[PDB]
Amino acid sequence: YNAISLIIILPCISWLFPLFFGRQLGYVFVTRMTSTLIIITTLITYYYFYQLLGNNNPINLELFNYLNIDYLDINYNFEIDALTITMLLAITTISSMVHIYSIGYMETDPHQVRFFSLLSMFTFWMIILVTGSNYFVLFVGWEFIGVTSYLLISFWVTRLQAM
Amino acid sequence: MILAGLILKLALYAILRLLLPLLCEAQILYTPMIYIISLLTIILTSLATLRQIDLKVIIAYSSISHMGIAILGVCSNTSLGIYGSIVLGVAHGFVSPALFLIVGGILYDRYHIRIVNYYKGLTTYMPQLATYIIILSFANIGTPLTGNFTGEFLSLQGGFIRNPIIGGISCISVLLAAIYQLKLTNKLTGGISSIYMHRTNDVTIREKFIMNILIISTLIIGICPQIMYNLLYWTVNNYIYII
Amino acid sequence: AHVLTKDMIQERIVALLESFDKVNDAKNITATANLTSDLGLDSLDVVEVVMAIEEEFGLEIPDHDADEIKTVQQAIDYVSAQPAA
Amino acid sequence: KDPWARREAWRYQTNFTRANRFKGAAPGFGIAVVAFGAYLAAEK
Amino acid sequence: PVPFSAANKKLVTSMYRQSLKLARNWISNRQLFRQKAVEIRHKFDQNAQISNPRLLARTLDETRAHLYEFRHPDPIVPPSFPGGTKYERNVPPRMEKIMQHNLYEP
Amino acid sequence: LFHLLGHAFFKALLFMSAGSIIHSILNESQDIRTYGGLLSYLPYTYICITIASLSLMAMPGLTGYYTKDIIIESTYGSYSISNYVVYWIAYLSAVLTCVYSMKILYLTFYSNPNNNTITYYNAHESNIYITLPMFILAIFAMFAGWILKDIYLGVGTDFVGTHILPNNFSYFDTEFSITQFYKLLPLISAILVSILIVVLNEFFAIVFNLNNKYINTVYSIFNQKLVSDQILNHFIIFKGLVTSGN
Amino acid sequence: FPPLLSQEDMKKHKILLAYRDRCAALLVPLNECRKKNYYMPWACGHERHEYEMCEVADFQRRVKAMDKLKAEKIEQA
Amino acid sequence: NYKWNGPLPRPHVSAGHRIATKFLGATMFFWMFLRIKEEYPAMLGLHNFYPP
Amino acid sequence: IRASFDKAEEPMLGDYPDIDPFPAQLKNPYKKYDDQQDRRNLEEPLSVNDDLYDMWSPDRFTHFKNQDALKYFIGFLTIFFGASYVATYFVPEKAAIPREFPYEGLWKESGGTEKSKAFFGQRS
Amino acid sequence: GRYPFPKDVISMTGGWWANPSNWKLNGLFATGIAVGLALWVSTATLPYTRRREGITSESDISKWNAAAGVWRERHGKISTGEA
Numbered sequence A: 001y002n003a004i005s006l007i008i009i010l011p012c013i014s015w016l017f018p019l020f021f022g023r024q025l026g027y028v029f030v031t032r033m034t035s036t037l038i039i040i041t042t043l044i045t046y047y048y049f050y051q052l053l054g055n056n057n058p059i060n061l062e063l064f065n066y067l068n069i070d071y072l073d074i075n076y077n078f079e080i081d082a083l084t085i086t087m088l089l090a091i092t093t094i095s096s097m098v099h100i101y102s103i104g105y106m107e108t109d110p111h112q113v114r115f116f117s118l119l120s121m122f123t124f125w126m127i128i129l130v131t132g133s134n135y136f137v138l139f140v141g142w143e144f145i146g147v148t149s150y151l152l153i154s155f156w157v158t159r160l161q162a163m
Numbered sequence B: 001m002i003l004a005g006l007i008l009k010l011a012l013y014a015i016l017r018l019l020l021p022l023l024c025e026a027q028i029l030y031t032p033m034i035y036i037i038s039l040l041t042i043i044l045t046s047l048a049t050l051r052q053i054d055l056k057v058i059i060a061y062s063s064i065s066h067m068g069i070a071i072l073g074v075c076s077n078t079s080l081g082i083y084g085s086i087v088l089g090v091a092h093g094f095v096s097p098a099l100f101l102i103v104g105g106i107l108y109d110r111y112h113i114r115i116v117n118y119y120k121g122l123t124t125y126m127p128q129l130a131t132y133i134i135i136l137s138f139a140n141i142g143t144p145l146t147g148n149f150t151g152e153f154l155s156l157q158g159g160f161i162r163n164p165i166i167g168g169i170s171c172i173s174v175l176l177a178a179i180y181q182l183k184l185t186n187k188l189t190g191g192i193s194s195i196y197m198h199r200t201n202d203v204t205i206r207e208k209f210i211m212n213i214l215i216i217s218t219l220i221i222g223i224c225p226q227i228m229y230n231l232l233y234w235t236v237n238n239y240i241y242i243i
Numbered sequence C: 001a002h003v004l005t006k007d008m009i010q011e012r013i014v015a016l017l018e019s020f021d022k023v024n025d026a027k028n029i030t031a032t033a034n035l036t037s038d039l040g041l042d043s044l045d046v047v048e049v050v051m052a053i054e055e056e057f058g059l060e061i062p063d064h065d066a067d068e069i070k071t072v073q074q075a076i077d078y079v080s081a082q083p084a085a
Numbered sequence D: 001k002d003p004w005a006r007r008e009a010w011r012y013q014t015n016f017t018r019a020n021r022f023k024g025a026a027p028g029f030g031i032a033v034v035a036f037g038a039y040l041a042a043e044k
Numbered sequence E: 001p002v003p004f005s006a007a008n009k010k011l012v013t014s015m016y017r018q019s020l021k022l023a024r025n026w027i028s029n030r031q032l033f034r035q036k037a038v039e040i041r042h043k044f045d046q047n048a049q050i051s052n053p054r055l056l057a058r059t060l061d062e063t064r065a066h067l068y069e070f071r072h073p074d075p076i077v078p079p080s081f082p083g084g085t086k087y088e089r090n091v092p093p094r095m096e097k098i099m100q101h102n103l104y105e106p
Numbered sequence F: 001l002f003h004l005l006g007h008a009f010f011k012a013l014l015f016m017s018a019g020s021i022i023h024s025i026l027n028e029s030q031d032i033r034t035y036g037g038l039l040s041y042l043p044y045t046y047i048c049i050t051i052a053s054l055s056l057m058a059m060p061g062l063t064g065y066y067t068k069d070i071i072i073e074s075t076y077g078s079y080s081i082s083n084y085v086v087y088w089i090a091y092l093s094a095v096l097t098c099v100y101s102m103k104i105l106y107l108t109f110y111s112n113p114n115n116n117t118i119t120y121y122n123a124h125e126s127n128i129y130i131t132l133p134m135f136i137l138a139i140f141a142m143f144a145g146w147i148l149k150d151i152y153l154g155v156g157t158d159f160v161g162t163h164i165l166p167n168n169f170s171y172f173d174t175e176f177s178i179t180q181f182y183k184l185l186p187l188i189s190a191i192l193v194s195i196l197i198v199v200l201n202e203f204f205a206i207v208f209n210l211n212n213k214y215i216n217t218v219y220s221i222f223n224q225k226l227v228s229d230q231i232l233n234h235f236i237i238f239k240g241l242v243t244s245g246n
Numbered sequence G: 001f002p003p004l005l006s007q008e009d010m011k012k013h014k015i016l017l018a019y020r021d022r023c024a025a026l027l028v029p030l031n032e033c034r035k036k037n038y039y040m041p042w043a044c045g046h047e048r049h050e051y052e053m054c055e056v057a058d059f060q061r062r063v064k065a066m067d068k069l070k071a072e073k074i075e076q077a
Numbered sequence H: 001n002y003k004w005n006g007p008l009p010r011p012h013v014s015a016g017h018r019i020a021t022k023f024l025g026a027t028m029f030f031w032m033f034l035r036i037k038e039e040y041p042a043m044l045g046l047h048n049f050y051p052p
Numbered sequence I: 001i002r003a004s005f006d007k008a009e010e011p012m013l014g015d016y017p018d019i020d021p022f023p024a025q026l027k028n029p030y031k032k033y034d035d036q037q038d039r040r041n042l043e044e045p046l047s048v049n050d051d052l053y054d055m056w057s058p059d060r061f062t063h064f065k066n067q068d069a070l071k072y073f074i075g076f077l078t079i080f081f082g083a084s085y086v087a088t089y090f091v092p093e094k095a096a097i098p099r100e101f102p103y104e105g106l107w108k109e110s111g112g113t114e115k116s117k118a119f120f121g122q123r124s
Numbered sequence J: 001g002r003y004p005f006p007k008d009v010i011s012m013t014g015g016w017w018a019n020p021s022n023w024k025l026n027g028l029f030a031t032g033i034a035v036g037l038a039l040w041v042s043t044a045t046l047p048y049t050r051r052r053e054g055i056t057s058e059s060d061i062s063k064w065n066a067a068a069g070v071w072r073e074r075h076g077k078i079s080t081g082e083a
């Protein structure tokens, strides 16, 4: 059990699985699954905020090297600051509630598999944007939320003004 | 595909292999002229793509703008710029023939015209082609975890070291490269399906095979550009003339 | 959801016309009725009732299709032509 | 004076009377005043 | 420019359509709007007995200008119609069988 | 950061109550000129949107009091002098953020109805999936400021590891050097302008429906986004497309 | 005014740099009271009242310094 | 649908929605009264800390 | 024809019909076209610089003239910044002195050494 | 709205109203893969976690400051502030 790791990995599961298995699982399953997983994520981040109120001792996880060139190293490093947990609980709470809301708001729309997948990839790249611990991971999340904003504002591809 | 994946990168290889070793004292005198020409071929070509009626011509002008980014990486006198120009050349040689396959293989075999005005609303009959089109558009822009951003970022950084003002006006290529690419992509994917196009087959197994290979090989360089540092760490120090 | 049928358009357009007062009277109404001649309208309160019938059904009419619904029956099938309700 | 006088009567009648239009405007005020009075009396 | 006709009728029926619709989105209140609607109804009824073409055209063009100045930024549109928000959300695709372009491969 | 925290809960409740009244109307309209009164028909959407707007107007005891007001007196209790000017500017936008908020509570719930009668026949309340997140975020947008205020506004707090320079820190000064008048002022004025805008739009309704063409020109300037998208569109986008064609 | 904390005990308790004056001696009980509870505002109220009335006594000596300086300015003028 | 352009009926809301709004409104007015009550001299601004 | 750049490409066309450019949005929506979306009949001649008059072109506002709107926009901006700058002169001043710091303004705490006290220093 | 659609076309995210008959059965597989991947990533990144404070002794940073003063004595490198 790793609290710093589940915050990252659970919305990525919640995104990658509605795309690769949307035709196989279907909208009535993928809706409940995507929301279920974001609910578990936001419960974990409430609990982590409750623990960091105990000691102000943050956690980072380290991964492999992005690039090592001469004077410049970039690593995938992820820490939850007090500032990070402040943004994190807000974005996960609003995320989970908008997921539950869109269960019932999108009931007669066709393409809600793609819709809930795009909502949780938006959540996921937001998580990555806030929990990153250099400026590079901040840039990565910063761009991918704009890519998701393209894919979300243009959800009705038939509509011209949306495109 | 062979042209825009290999010939342009061959001349990018020739400027390292032929000029930087025995024209060092010349090269220092001339890098402001190269920066004039490379900023001026980023801006003016990236701007001239906005008014194009044809579809393969847009990806040709895209290749101009990316090679203009790579030349101010090699001519930067920096280890970062040399490495970023090599990453840009390799990642561009991946992602651009996939775009030429999108326009020339999946789109010209089916309809035999290349004008932009016939193509609208390709998602509703071809959802995974549209998936490919948007993934490749963002991969071509400089959207990170792609290898194109690693090349563009390190080449812009080297060009900022060698001259900060032409680095400042060369950094707007991030904007200019995205304008025409997304302007094409939302026209192709969005809208009601075209009344000119009759519905054809979706993308086939061999086209998806070529696309999947050319997308994985950008994503691996984009997630970890270190995988080919073991070849280059000599040659990144070899061409530097900082006395 | 909510379906309309033609019974409903009938009893809504006649309901709209019985609460209008500048009609001749409330019982020479039927589907066949010219608004010009039968119900005694001038050329501009046929336009006030076109405005009323387009706000009534929640729909909007261009000028070259408002002019030609001069009977009540043409109005009923013209309003039934559109998918919006 | 108004030709559409019998049409636009339902907007002023039974549910959009002036008395009904201000009815749900403070729905829990009446329970909260006595709950606050209970808290005032139970503070002591 | 023309006395009692079908074409002059066409013109000012559409002009009365336009001013009613245009007054519709200025006024929030219902009875202020309908006081105002009966007021310009009165304005149309004080005219329409002019037999001249000179001042019929002069009043015609300046009430066209008076109509032009009180124009609104947002017209009220119902959403499933071309100004609105529900317009072209899920256009149903037309039923088309697959045309084929290659002898060997789909 | 504290305002950032509370604002998320506010605006999520406001956007979702807006979506429930757009979803509840058969027409699916968005113009508030076409909504009319819906207080009798939609009490749950009403009570949630009333909680959200009383919080965003920073009316006290709710989250927006603690997030939004202390910024306005931090403009006054600054060390620098011309920050006093932005005291008024933010304060002006305090009063205005009451005004439109009352618009989107008046013309939607209290007004005489503007839609056709069948919308009022078919107006019902939405599913449990729509109502439950509105309930949870209403509870959060009420209680979150009072619980998390000691985390983000203590007078000595070591939670956020930000290092303010010792002269740019003006918090001890800004809670003590404020006048009775300057602290009393945005609360009472934000409640007075709210009650006045609602009472004037019912009792009189001619103050806002004047048809001076100067005020209509000014209104359509403020309606078309302070004409900015025309200034961006014709003079940057269209200009750039013409030079790119050149 | 509480006795001014000595400088390496300011570095013990890791007081932030904007908080170190001669009111800070009442701040380090408070923060640890704040860390015994979980920053909950109903609890730990006696000690923040102590600290902020130190900080008012500081504020009024600041005000008295300023009105001294305005008397100083106009008698120079 | 049974009437047109005449007096509407009083609506049918559920018991549960009607209970939930009275709970939310009672909670908001009670909580606002308690937080005016306890924060009164800080809320309105009184006993200011300028010296006499 | 109507625009200045459309006038500028007049002598380059030959064997080309020289259409009057009309925006595809400002057409009627209720006339039935072959494509309702692009608002275009099936063999209708395209202008030169037609992608500036297409449906996928800029939005091309209808309500103000563009020179009018530039006057109104620069108006509101200089209104705000002029009132902003004149309102700095009518300000009242403070009721406290800016607060000061022990250990000679925490200079050792703010990095610093004794030659570097003015660079890294506080009020004392 | 339940307009008809062509069943010709296959998308990976489902199509229009994609709801297969065995969505329970496939849902059990998706459940298993999701919990197994989350558990496995959870335990795999455990030793790559560390705290922010309390890693190294203060002896370390005191003597590193001392050795930085050593490296600054030998190059005669002057302050930021003295000019």
Ligand SMILES: CCCCCCCCCCCC(=O)OC[C@H](COP(=O)(O)OCC[N+](C)(C)C)OC(=O)CCCCCCCCCCC
Binding pocket: A062, A063, A064, A065, A076, B219, B220, B223, B224
């Ligand atoms: C958010 C976007 C991330 C995308 C993740 C994509 C999958 C990559 C998962 C690797 C995680 C990992 O294996 O990392 C864990 C290891 C170890 O980490 P270490 O600290 O370097 O070594 C330990 C240092 N000690 C001793 C100080 C602690 O990594 C590595 O060194 C192996 C590098 C292999 C990267 C090859 C990537 C090839 C592309 C794969 C995708 C197509």
